[PDB]
Amino acid sequence: MRIHFILHETFEAPGAYLAWAALRGHDVSMTKVYRYEKLPKDIDDFDMLILMGGPQSPSSTKKEFPYYDAQAEVKLIQKAAKSEKIIVGVCLGAQLMGVAYGADYLHSPKKEIGNYLISLTEAGKMDSYLSDFSDDLLVGHWHGDMPGLPDKAQVLAISQGCPRQIIKFGPKQYAFQCHLEFTPELVAALIAQEDDLDTQSQTETYVQTAEEMQTFDYSSMNQALYSFLDRLTE
């Protein structure tokens, strides 16, 4: 019901997570750390915590991003977990969850930017909250890194480029390295930020073109996401 977002840049938007939260009638708050907004001090003001992506890494320094405090975000995840809050972390958000749960983050075998299949693991095929995901699904991607896997965490999905797409850290604490929340306008903003998506498009296996991404139809990923959030919170 009270859902709090942590946002790390204008181009790392909540997209469909926010839309879902609006349609289902939930009570949204946000922290826009890039606006030097202060992280919540109490886990008491929210029921669920969704941390979105970001150009930073979990180890980025305040000399690079003077408003960003990865340590504080990690502690906030741990406080939240320790009270059995629902948590979801996306790209950078998924990597801070890794750190919070005892594993440091890694570089991805392949970097991925565009819309690619992810594929359920065995553990994935057994997760209640993913019932509405076909075994293979085309979803969004925009990373170079991926999350640490602590021993108690399960991988629920992989792609060809990256072996850790979705991870279950806890009974109600999930991480998506990939982006199901994309829409054409979010993807517009990401393209505007990307230096040389052109060159990377041919030089690299798993980078698509501005045109490929921009024309793509995102309604199925949004919709798969909705089924996950609905199930996670029911």
UniProtKB/TrEMBL annotation:
This is Glutamine amidotransferase domain-containing protein. NCBIfam families: PRK08250.1. It comes from Streptococcus mutans serotype c (strain ATCC 700610 / UA159). InterPro entries: ChyE-like (IPR044992), Class_I_gatase-like (IPR029062), GATASE (IPR017926). It holds the Pfam family GATase. It comes from the Bacteria. GO terms for cellular component: cytosol. Residues 32-185 form the Glutamine amidotransferase domain. SUPFAM superfamilies: Class I glutamine amidotransferase-like.
